[PDB]
From a paper:
In addition, to dissect how the mutations S31Δ, F456L, and Q493E affect the overall spike stability, we introduced these mutations into the JN.1.11 spike protein. Additionally, we also determined apo spike protein structures of engineered JN.1-derived mutants carrying S31Δ, F456L, and Q493E. Our results demonstrated that S31Δ indeed induces a fully glycan-occupied N30 glycosylation site in all of the variants carrying the S31 deletion, including JN.1.11 + S31Δ, JN.1.11.1 + S31Δ, JN.1.11 + Q493E + S31Δ, and KP.3.1.1. Similarly, JN.1.11 + S31Δ, JN.1.11.1 + S31Δ, and JN.1.11 + Q493E + S31Δ also shared similar NTD structures with KP.3.1.1. Using 3D variability analysis, we quantified the particle proportion for each conformational state and found that S31Δ did not affect the proportions of “one RBD up” and “all RBD down” particles by comparing the proportion of JN.1.11 and other spike proteins that have S31Δ. The data from three paired variant sets (JN.1.11 & JN.1.11 + S31Δ, JN.1.11.1 & JN.1.11.1 + S31Δ, and JN.1.11 + Q493E & JN.1.11 + Q493E + S31Δ) showed that S31Δ has little impact on hACE2 binding, which is consistent with previous studies. Besides, while F456L alone did not affect hACE2 binding (JN.1.11.1 has F456L compared to JN.1.11), Q493E alone substantially reduced binding affinity, which is also consistent with prior research and is likely due to the electrostatic repulsion between hACE2-E35 and RBD-E49317. RBD-Q493E alone in the presence of F456 would likely be disfavored due to an electrostatic repulsion with hACE2-E35. Q493E alone reduced hACE2 binding, while F456L by itself had minimal impact on the binding; however, hACE2 binding with the Q493E mutation was recovered in the context of F456L (JN.1.11 + S31Δ+Q493E vs. KP.3.1.1). In addition, other spike mutants with Q493E retain BD55-1205 binding, while F456L resulted in a binding affinity decrease where the only mutation of JN.1.11.1 is F456L compared to JN.1.11.
The JN.1-sublineage KP.3.1.1 recently emerged as the globally prevalent SARS-CoV-2 variant, demonstrating increased infectivity and antibody escape. We investigate how mutations and a deletion in the KP.3.1.1 spike protein (S) affect hACE2 binding and antibody escape. To investigate the effects of N30 glycosylation introduced by S31Δ and two RBD mutations (F456L and Q493E) on the structure and function of the spike protein, we determined the cryo-EM structures of the recent SARS-CoV-2 variants KP.3.1.1 and JN.1.11 along with engineered variants JN.1.11 + S31Δ+Q493E, JN.1.11.1 + S31Δ, and JN.1.11 + S31Δ. The spike proteins exhibited three conformational states: “one RBD up,” “all RBD down,” and “flexible” (i.e., one or two RBDs disordered in the density maps due to flexibility).
Numbering used by the authors:
A (entry chain A): 710 to 759
B (entry chain B): 710 to 827, 849 to 1153
C (entry chain A): 860 to 959
D (entry chain A): 1010 to 1059
E (entry chain C): 1110 to 1153
F (entry chain C): 610 to 677, 689 to 709
The structure:
Amino acid sequence: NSIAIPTNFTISVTTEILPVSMTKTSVDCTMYICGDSTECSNLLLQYGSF
Amino acid sequence: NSIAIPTNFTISVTTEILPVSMTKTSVDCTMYICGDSTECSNLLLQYGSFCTQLKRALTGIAVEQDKNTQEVFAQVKQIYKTPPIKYFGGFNFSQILPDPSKPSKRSPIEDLLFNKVTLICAQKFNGLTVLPPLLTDEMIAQYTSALLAGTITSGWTFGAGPALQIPFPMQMAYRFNGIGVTQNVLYENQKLIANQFNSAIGKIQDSLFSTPSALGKLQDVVNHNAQALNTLVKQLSSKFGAISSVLNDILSRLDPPEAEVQIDRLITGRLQSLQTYVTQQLIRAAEIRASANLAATKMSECVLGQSKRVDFCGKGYHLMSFPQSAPHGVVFLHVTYVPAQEKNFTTAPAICHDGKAHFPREGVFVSNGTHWFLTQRNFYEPQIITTDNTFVSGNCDVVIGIVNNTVYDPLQLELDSFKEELD
Amino acid sequence: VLPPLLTDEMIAQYTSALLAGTITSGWTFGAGPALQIPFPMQMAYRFNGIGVTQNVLYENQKLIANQFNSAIGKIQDSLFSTPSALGKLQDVVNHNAQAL
Amino acid sequence: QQLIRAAEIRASANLAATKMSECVLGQSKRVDFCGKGYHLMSFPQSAPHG
Amino acid sequence: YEPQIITTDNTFVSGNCDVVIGIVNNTVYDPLQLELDSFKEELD
Amino acid sequence: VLYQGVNCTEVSVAIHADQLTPTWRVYSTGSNVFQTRAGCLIGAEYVNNSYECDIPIGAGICASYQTQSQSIIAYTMSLGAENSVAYSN
Ligand SMILES: *[C@@H]1O[C@H](CO)[C@@H](O[C@@H]2O[C@H](CO)[C@@H](O[C@@H]3O[C@H](CO)[C@@H](O)[C@H](O)[C@@H]3O)[C@H](O)[C@H]2NC(C)=O)[C@H](O)[C@H]1NC(C)=O
Ligand SMILES: *[C@@H]1O[C@H](CO)[C@@H](O[C@@H]2O[C@H](CO)[C@@H](O[C@@H]3O[C@H](CO)[C@@H](O)[C@H](O)[C@@H]3O)[C@H](O)[C@H]2NC(C)=O)[C@H](O)[C@H]1NC(C)=O
Ligand SMILES: *[C@@H]1O[C@H](CO)[C@@H](O[C@@H]2O[C@H](CO)[C@@H](O[C@@H]3O[C@H](CO)[C@@H](O)[C@H](O)[C@@H]3O)[C@H](O)[C@H]2NC(C)=O)[C@H](O)[C@H]1NC(C)=O
Ligand SMILES: *[C@@H]1O[C@H](CO)[C@@H](O[C@@H]2O[C@H](CO)[C@@H](O)[C@H](O)[C@H]2NC(C)=O)[C@H](O)[C@H]1NC(C)=O
Ligand SMILES: *[C@@H]1O[C@H](CO)[C@@H](O[C@@H]2O[C@H](CO)[C@@H](O)[C@H](O)[C@H]2NC(C)=O)[C@H](O)[C@H]1NC(C)=O
Ligand SMILES: *[C@@H]1O[C@H](CO)[C@@H](O[C@@H]2O[C@H](CO)[C@@H](O)[C@H](O)[C@H]2NC(C)=O)[C@H](O)[C@H]1NC(C)=O
Ligand SMILES: *[C@@H]1O[C@H](CO)[C@@H](O)[C@H](O)[C@H]1NC(C)=O
Ligand SMILES: *[C@@H]1O[C@H](CO)[C@@H](O)[C@H](O)[C@H]1NC(C)=O
Ligand SMILES: *[C@@H]1O[C@H](CO)[C@@H](O)[C@H](O)[C@H]1NC(C)=O
């Protein structure tokens, strides 16, 4: 037969931090693998649509 | 001291489209890398259990896709049916309920959804096969029909216990109380509400039929699976440094040693292509799983219940939702209450009568310029300020912005009507 | 690296719009047209939401406003003082930098 | 690695959007969804990538 | 299921009888009037 | 066994011609060959009776081990019992 009841209250503010987006990147596949090289690019073509 | 209160409302129907399942694929690893070649298969054996891992990954994905469909649609204990008379208080559900006159027993909207999104694997038949779903389109349509019959005839009761019939207008009356609008608003305006609902459904059909991009979320899944398989097949034509992409030509012209070198080059390339395909399918499977789990959550909370979560079951205050089957997914029609035609009224936090502060029990105090009334928050309906509508706590001085107005106590006036003279 | 489609100013404008809506209209603007309501009455309804009567807010309105203002000042002091408060975002920036 | 990270960011963004709708544009009865205590209201703030 | 007597405390009044579709005729008991009637109205 | 993506006629012909690659053979007697959308199911007797799904096969068809002695039975899976709600005004 015992209950506890608040006689006062506090207003509290908390912070929640969430990521929303990631840095948007792009890669020039040919330049990365075979930069400024025609011969490498021609060999790269034999690997298909990677 | 200014509050705006709706004097009218609109019943709105919105469409949410979610993927549920992905095309189930399987790959014959040996046939893809080393098709009809014993020598290549023997070299492939030296790479260990890569084909076994690829097979387990694709099997797990296929099982997961059947799990996703089962979890989203098989949420009803029994297959419920509507009465033979499709009369529900004046609400017309004929466009969402199954049409008995056509094969597959789908609703007009489901047929539109199936026609907009586009057995024997004649294409890509290079060791790559597609498995059928465990549940057929008819079985999914039957689950959707059962969910609609349950919602329409029993409201939310069938989703948390046995199905209990309730007249549809009373189901709406309870849904109105849920959003925070009294029952008399629905009953006095029942015809308007039924007409707005029927109009909104017709608009849903016109919107989905007219706009080719309405179902892009599902078409993107179909297109991404098609691209993944077209790429995987296209990679077979690559040489990867070999003299030829065809194993039969390598074996036809070269002796075993040189053939083994050229074959190892092709095995490495094809194995890399399969590993990339499976990894991409696992990532896509995770995305589809998340979507299917969201669709199942929405099915449970929007269709089998009523949700207080803002924007979870469409924009506006949620009343109810109706599922529709779609290829590789589910479409939810969310029926919400949207406030309309607001008017600006003066307000006050409390009314002073005789030194006491009166606060609304269920409502807001408003003033039409000259007279104070109590109204419900979401629908203008002025009522006389009384001791039954308000409660008393504290004195007049404590409340900031309190105004002076009469609070009518029906008891005292009734007593005064009974003669006080006695003689 | 491609820029975001929305600039930091555009995101700030969306945040400002959301704050103005919440402060001046409560939840009404998020499920229909925006309807103005005095802020103390918005709080009174929020108190009824948690299950506390309106008179608690109105009799204690000054205490509640003071506690709110104090809590906000504490938020600024907490975020400014602690360098790790935003680690969840810095980890994303750092992981992208490490990957590249 | 970027695809896996993108999936994690998507899940975070979907949680942030759910919280925006239920905490800022409404009032939520979900315990600990909108902070500790009984929820009254929430205010968004912009942050880099979140 | 817990049947209770229809009273002015259990229900609220809004609008007239004609507007509601499917409304039925039944007595709504107002405890106040009966209590008043118990207190003698004759006075003499 | 289930031969996926193939017609039962093609499998039967391949069996009679001794062309099918696996060297084992299922008895494949009368009533044990059933055409499904998933493929050709050999070694299970299809029954019209619908039961809850046990071992999934595909395209709505499931199989289980049942007493009818016992054998493997193929069937179209049941979705649930029917319950017509006594709806009225
Ligand atoms: C519930 O609504 C449906 C429609 O949403 C009512 O059924 C009838 O549906 C057809 C749809 O084609 C309506 O238009 C018809 O179009 C064809 C051409 O497509 C035309 O040749 C017909 O003359 C007709 O215009 C049709 O008007 C509609 N019926 C009525 C009376 O409007 C269904 O009757 C509704 N149920 C109830 C109980 O009102
Ligand atoms: C609350 O808003 C609804 C509409 O959202 C109001 O009902 C609408 O009332 C107008 C005028 O009475 C109707 O227009 C009329 O329609 C008939 C159709 O035959 C036409 O012949 C007339 O010439 C006129 O165009 C409108 O159809 C009706 N809408 C619906 C869905 O019933 C309602 O009166 C508003 N209530 C208040 C208190 O403002
Ligand atoms: C419920 O709790 C609140 C605080 O959480 C109580 O209010 C607080 O009351 C104390 C004493 O009256 C205040 O302290 C005083 O502050 C003034 C500021 O100028 C200072 O000069 C005094 O010497 C003393 O330190 C305290 O500031 C105040 N807090 C707030 C936020 O107003 C409230 O009285 C409690 N109510 C009950 C019924 O217990
Ligand atoms: C505010 O509302 C009150 C009552 O709802 C209006 O008072 C009534 O006005 C009509 C006008 O035709 C009279 O017939 C009634 O007899 C009036 N009743 C009372 C008790 O005064 C009042 O006019 C409204 N004021 C505004 C500005 O809208
Ligand atoms: C509501 O009415 C009360 C009186 O019933 C007003 O209280 C009076 O306010 C005047 C202001 O000059 C004082 O001089 C009187 O002594 C007050 N009398 C009492 C009994 O308190 C009260 O101000 C009115 N409130 C409003 C907003 O008009
Ligand atoms: C409820 O009772 C009222 C009378 O108190 C009924 O109203 C009468 O209905 C008959 C129908 O033929 C009319 O001829 C009378 O003129 C009506 N009188 C009044 C005062 O309205 C009402 O129909 C009853 N409702 C039901 C459902 O029985
Ligand atoms: C609100 O109504 C008042 C009059 O009651 C009017 O002066 C004010 O311009 C209105 N505001 C809007 C935004 O309609
Ligand atoms: C199998 O072949 C027969 C040949 O007559 C044809 O009728 C039947 O439809 C085919 N079934 C499938 C599933 O290909
Ligand atoms: C409900 O009322 C309508 C009124 O037109 C009637 O047609 C319908 O048959 C009634 N339903 C039942 C179950 O009696």
